[PDB]
Design a protein around this ligand. Sequence first.
Ligand SMILES: [Co+2]
Length: 257
Amino acid sequence: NWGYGKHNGPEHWHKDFPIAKGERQSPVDIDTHTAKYDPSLKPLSVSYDQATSLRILNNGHAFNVEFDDSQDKAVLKGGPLDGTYRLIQFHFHWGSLDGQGSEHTVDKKKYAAELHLVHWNTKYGDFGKAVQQPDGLAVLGIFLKVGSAKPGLQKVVDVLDSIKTKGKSADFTNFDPRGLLPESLDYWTYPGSLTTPPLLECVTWIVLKEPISVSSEQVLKFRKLNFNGEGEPEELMVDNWRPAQPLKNRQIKASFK
Ligand SMILES: [Co+2]
């Protein structure tokens, strides 16, 4: 029964999910002066040319754009990753105001939103088995700032009025996630967790340094979604971000000098 409010939000999750106070929780603050360039990282490879989306779903916490991951398509590899990870879905975390919304922070700076592209390690056969493994997942995180519109986001924006409330879904085919990526693949990486219950400690995080810009009108449409179900009192879907968690002696590596 978890959420982001006063009585069910991040400060309460540890009761049902004690891993919330674990040794490799996410998100974290990225202290850019403490992160070390790692010259042994091979280039990151994001290969989304054959990505095939299926549906978009309001799950009562965010919206998920889901992909058909039944074939070797939409693959993340290289960088800190061993082997190949396959895209399963993406979603966002965002604020009630432009000054907050991201989960990761950069020298304490909060962005207006954060995009998470979730991939599972193909050595484990599927997502469900992957989330039983310490290297089961790789999440590519991308910061959003408010400025110029992101043309590739508009198809997502325009479908949201059909999934206003918890439990609504719409078919959502032929969406190209390449249109959501910034120019540079410079990144920070560290071992962490899912940022929503069950907070599983399976994730190699790859957080891009370059944000994308989205327009005020685009993020305003995110903020018109509802946490509640149809026919329930309206609670706007805003501030669905978990705050930074203790680093606990992990090291953040930078892909760039
Ligand atoms: Co997320």
